[PDB]
Design a protein around this ligand. Structure first.
Ligand SMILES: [Cl-]
Length: 289
């Protein structure tokens, strides 16, 4: 059950917000800073520590946090609680011990992430989006490869933290404008269809093995230059038909007109026939213990 924590409990859990416990990607001074920690009951947690003045009205912070806290789903890194003591504003979620899509996709060591695992990620994150939308939390802020986490069993989950803004009013620059949907640039506002565009960028990441700007990818797609778009490290793991099917889904997600983008259920349905190696456990596919 969603619960409140004292700041002392959370400082104890994170060794006083020790810098080496940061597991997010922007360091200590960013709008989005997440620390790993461990509670007295041995439960491992992720703690997002909001900036001072980001959510100054604790009633508003709590309302938001509690709303996110009602969500419970296997495709999410779920929100367990919050803290709003002594000007701190913290979100406490399930710890994900196998790091991020970014680590395994962009910063691989043994070998590139397998196609089968990339497609499993895409499907499971689409399912996470379907769930969040189902529970009235259709807005998601800054979805990218750093918000896709891997659990104890190496299964992909969507971080719950992106369901809340980094600050109620502060302009965030947490996603470079190259990756934001066109309606954000016009209005400064996120809509349900905005996250679908972001999901399109995630598909581009998975297809290419890098965080390719949509403008550039869309040029390649217009040219049907699949060989320049797709990750050379995937060679021989996928049929041209399936590669193309996923590119076509990305193109739908990245449509200028928000109403033309797929709804989450359509993303899930489109992903099913592309799945590969269903019988293989995620830890084997991802290459973690
Ligand atoms: Cl506020």
């Amino acid at each position: 059950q969603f619960r409140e924590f004292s700041i002392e409990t959370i400082r104890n859990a994170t060794s006083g917000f020790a810098a080496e416990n940061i597991v997010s990607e922007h360091g200590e001074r960013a709008p989005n800073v997440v620390y790993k920690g461990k509670l007295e009951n041995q439960r491992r947690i992720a703690v997002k520590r909001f900036n001072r003045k980001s959510w100054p009205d604790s009633r508003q912070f709590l309302e938001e946090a509690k709303a996110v806290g009602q969500l419970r789903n296997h495709r999410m890194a779920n929100l367990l609680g919050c803290c709003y003591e002594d000007e701190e504003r913290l979100l406490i979620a399930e710890f994900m011990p196998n790091e991020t899509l970014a680590k395994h996709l962009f910063h691989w060591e043994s070998q590139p992430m397998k196609w089968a695992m990339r497609l499993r990620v895409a499907l499971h994150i689409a399912q996470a989006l379907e769930y969040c939308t189902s529970k009235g939390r259709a807005l998601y802020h800054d979805l990218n490869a750093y918000r896709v986490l891997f659990d104890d069993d190496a299964n992909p989950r969507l971080s719950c933290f992106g369901l809340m803004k980094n600050s109620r009013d502060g302009k965030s620059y947490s996603t470079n404008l190259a990756f934001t949907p066109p309606e954000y640039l016009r209005t400064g506002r996120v809509t349900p269809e905005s996250v679908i565009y972001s999901f399109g960028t995630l598909l581009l990441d998975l297809l290419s093995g890098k965080h390719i700007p949509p403008s550039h990818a869309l040029d390649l797609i217009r040219d049907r230059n699949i060989q320049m778009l797709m990750d050379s490290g995937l060679e021989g793991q996928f049929s041209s038909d399936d590669g193309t099917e996923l590119i076509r889904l990305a193109s739908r997600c990245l449509q200028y007109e928000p109403r033309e983008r797929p709804n989450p259920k359509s993303l899930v349905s489109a992903m099913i026939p592309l799945q590969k190696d269903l019988e293989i456990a995620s830890h084997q596919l991802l290459g973690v213990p």
